[PDB]
Every structure is written in structure tokens, then in C-alpha cells.
């Protein structure tokens, strides 16, 4: 088995987070944008591409109008199946809020779910500063992306105000929003296609991820002193996320080392992750040794249930 990953960027927001994965290269997995309007698309490098709703909006984007996103999904749902066939895990990006994401994001999410492919939706909320409305319609896109996907990933783009200085160019900013959809997708790369020493593989993903809602995912890297917990401290932190680890009652982690990696500090690692989570937690846990690290350990922790 060797599972298939597609990553489909829907709307504007997340065909920007598709093609800033597409410039970096992400070998086995499968890029598809979907959107309204066909002059976004046409600019597009992704090898898949499916405008839809071209009879609804006349190859313009949704004008905020999520109805429109909708019904443009559902005009075009024929297409989304053709794009989405033999997927194993599917992530659905999309800003949240506007009209194509907040419409059709869920429309694509219930396919693949529906096609089997373990759904993951990692979705931006609306910046304060673009209004309630903007934030009403984002909040609406969020409910129906929980239903309609099995774990999902919310990042509100407030918490990019909280990570700049004054000067901070915004697209900056925006690049380590996209960072947490390409951590994500290297990560499952990396389980899929490496023997662990107490090997994780695809089986153990869908017992943490599937039919759950929102989740924590998080990566932390130290060295020296004191590394493991403060490896593992890190990979709980996610100030980008909204959910927190408090109460996860479903766990994947692994602890990748270098020939050095203790028994002790993994303990150790282990046990900040689990004081965060709940009493009863079904955690998974892994181990890679890496000979070519040295001094550096690398937590990687996904938590579900709540
Ligand atoms: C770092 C990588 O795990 C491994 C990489 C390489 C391996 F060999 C092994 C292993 N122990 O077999 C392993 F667990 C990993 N990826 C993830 C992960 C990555 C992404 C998500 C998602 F889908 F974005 F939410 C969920 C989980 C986790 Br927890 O751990
Ligand atoms: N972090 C981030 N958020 C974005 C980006 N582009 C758009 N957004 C957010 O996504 C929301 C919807 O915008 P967009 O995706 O362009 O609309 P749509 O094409 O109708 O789905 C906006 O209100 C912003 O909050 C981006 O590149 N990065
Ligand atoms: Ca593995």
C-alpha cells in the first residue's frame, strides 16, 4: 500500500496556498484548483484544474456570494468526481468567508469523503479588520466544512497579526499561514513513504482522523539541553490554530532522532503531550531514527477528539 494525496486549493485563499506548494515542489502528491473564475485559473501551474459553475458565473469568481460558490460546485459536481478518483487522503484548502471557498469547499470535501478518501480541510477565518459579515459567512463555511470533512484545521488569519512586527511584508505573513497545509502534507510524505523503528502508517492515521472535527497538529525541532520537552512543548503550541490540545482524546505523535534519541527523553516528550490531552487518550505513538541528524529531535504531533 502506498496511499494517494491530493491536495485541491478551492477559491481564491486556497488556490494562493496550492501554488505556493506547487513553486516549493511536493513529490507524490497530486495538485488540483478548483475555482469560478477562469482568469485565476488560467494562471494556475497545478496539472488538474476544474472551473466550475461557468454557466452560473460566466467565468467570473463568486463576488463573495457562497450561494454561488455552492451552486457552482453543484453544476460542476461531475468534474470534482473525475479530479478526486483514486484518492486515499484528500486535503481541501480554502479561505473561509468568501463565496467560492465558503460554498463549494464543502461541496468537495462531502466527494471525497463520499469516494472514501480520508478528508482533512485546512481553512483561514477572516482578518477582524474585513468585517462581521466577512466573519458571519466564514463562521457558516467553517459548520459546514466540519460536517462535511473527517478532521479539520481552522487557522484565523487574526493570529497572523500576532506573529509580524510593524514592518512585516504581508505576504510574509501569508507564507507561514500556507506553512502549516505543507508541514502537514510532508509529514503524511514522510509516514507513508519511511520504515519507523516503531513505524506509524496509514491505518494509524485514519484511527486518529477519521469521522473527528476540529484538530490540533503541530510540529516542534530543538537541540541541546532539554530537547525533547521543549520539542514537544513547541509541537503543542500551534499559535496559529485555534484549537488547543486541552482534552484531545485521540493522539498520533511521533519523535523523529538521530542515533542519540533516548529512552528517557521520549518518555519525557510523551509525557508533556499526554498531560495536555485527556485522561482517556487514544494515542498513537512513533518513533523514527534518522542517522544522518545529529543533536536535533523532531516532534510531530496531530490531536482529534475533543
Ligand atoms: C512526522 C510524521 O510521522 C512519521 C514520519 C516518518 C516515519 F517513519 C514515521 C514512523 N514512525 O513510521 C512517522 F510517524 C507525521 N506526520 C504527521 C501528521 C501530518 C499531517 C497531518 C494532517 F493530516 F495534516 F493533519 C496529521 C499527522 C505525524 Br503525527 O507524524
Ligand atoms: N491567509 C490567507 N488568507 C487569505 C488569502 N487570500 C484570501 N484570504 C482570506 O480568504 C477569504 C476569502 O477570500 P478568497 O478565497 O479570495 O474568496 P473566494 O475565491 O470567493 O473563495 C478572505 O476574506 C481572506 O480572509 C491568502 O492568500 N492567505
Ligand atoms: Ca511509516
New binding site residues.
Partial sequence: HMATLKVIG?????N??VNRMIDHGMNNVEFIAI???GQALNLSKAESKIQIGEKLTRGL??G?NPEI?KKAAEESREQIEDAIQGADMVFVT?????????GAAPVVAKIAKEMGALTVGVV????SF?GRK?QTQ?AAGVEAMKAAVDTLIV?P?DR?LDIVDKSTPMMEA?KE??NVLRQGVQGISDLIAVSGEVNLDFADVKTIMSNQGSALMGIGVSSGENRAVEAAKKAISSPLLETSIVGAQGVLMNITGGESLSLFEAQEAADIVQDAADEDVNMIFGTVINPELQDEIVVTVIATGF
Fill in positions: 478551492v477559491g481564491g485563499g486556497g494562493n496556498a475555482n469560478t473564475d469568481g463568486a463573495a460558490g480554502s479561505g473561509m468567508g468568501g463565496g467560492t471557498g465558503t483561514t477565518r477572516p482578518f474585513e466577512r466564514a487557522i488569519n497572523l501569508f499561514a500556507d
